[PDB]
Design a protein around this ligand. Structure first.
Ligand SMILES: Nc1ncnc2c1ncn2[C@@H]1O[C@H](COP(=O)(O)OP(=O)(O)NP(=O)(O)O)[C@@H](O)[C@H]1O
Ligand SMILES: [Mg+2]
Length: 277
């Protein structure tokens, strides 16, 4: 699919830099015709077929195609898409409340109530995606944005669909790999992947939300991946002594090596703790 090739600077005024990635930079922008604000994601294109730098057309188109299909309170939406010789520019919905990561960094640890307020929105966002057979594959604090972090119960939206994939055959087998701390055992072992991988990530996120600690984090990447594959983690009393046994149960049913035994998004929503290189 070809995108709008006019100069994006003729329709938008960019400003502050919101975020950055290995092959992408996000900037706040304002559309001239409406005065409305957005997050412009510039993705670097590959210059040759056999290049490591930049993102292949196939991958950029996959992210765009998945972004054009979604419309939900807890997920980011795509406004327009421009491109030129070096980059493809995704004009996305702005989320100016900052990353859950920076939020958590500033608060250390939350209460089960605060945690569940965030968790329920994330689950709702993931329920929507899984319903469309969309696997995010990169769920983590850094890919969860708040709309306004100066509120007692901040609303969130999931972002970064750079690794998202459609799962129409129950499983995908293509070496999809994200951040070691949050990837499930099947990703670490390069086994077929499906919607289940997102549920494992939710578990890690949940563990983090309640304790401020990472469950499998090791001093190096290989160690972390090793801990993940062996499901090497425990609920440290120093961190969880005042955490309810129900919250641990919820985490425990997500951090399961076997994908077919892991809780599904529907299960997690009906769980007693949630249910109202
Ligand atoms: N819609 C948005 N609104 C506000 N900030 C955003 C938005 N999308 C992304 N960001 C910020 O920009 C950062 C990078 O965006 P992201 O889409 O995650 O790219 P990436 O996948 O890291 N890129 P790359 O490394 O090139 O593949 C995020 O982690 C956020 O801080
Ligand atoms: Mg990212």
């Amino acid at each position: 699919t070809v995108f709008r090739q006019e100069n994006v600077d003729d329709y938008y005024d960019t400003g502050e830099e919101l975020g950055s990635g290995q092959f992408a930079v996000v900037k706040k922008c304002r559309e001239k015709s409406t005065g409305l604000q957005y997050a412009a994601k510039f993705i670097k294109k590959r210059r040759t077929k056999s290049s490591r730098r930049g993102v292949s057309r196939e991958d950029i188109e996959r992210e765009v195609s998945i972004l054009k299909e979604i419309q939900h309170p807890n997920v980011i939406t795509l406004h327009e898409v421009y491109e030129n010789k070096t980059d493809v520019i995704l004009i996305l919905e702005l989320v100016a409340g900052g990353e859950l990561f920076d939020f958590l960094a500033e608060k250390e640890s939350l209460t089960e109530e605060e945690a569940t307020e965030f968790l329920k929105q994330i689950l709702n966002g993931v329920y929507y995606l899984h319903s469309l057979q969309i696997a995010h594959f990169d769920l983590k604090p850094e890919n969860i944005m708040l709309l306004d972090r100066n509120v007692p119960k901040p609303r969130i939206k999931i972002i970064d669909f750079g690794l998202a994939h459609k799962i129409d055959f129950g499983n995908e087998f293509k070496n999809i790999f994200g951040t070691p701390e949050f990837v499930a055992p099947e990703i670490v072992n390069y086994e077929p992947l499906g919607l289940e991988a997102d549920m494992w990530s939710i578990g890690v996120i949940t563990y983090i939300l309640l304790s401020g600690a990472s469950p499998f984090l090791g001093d190096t990447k290989q160690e972390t991946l090793a801990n993940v594959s062996a499901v090497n983690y425990e609920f440290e009393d120093e961190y969880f002594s005042n955490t309810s046994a129900l919250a641990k149960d919820f985490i425990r049913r997500l951090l399961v090596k076997d994908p077919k035994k892991r809780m599904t998004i529907q299960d997690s929503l009906q769980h007693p703790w949630i249910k109202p290189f």
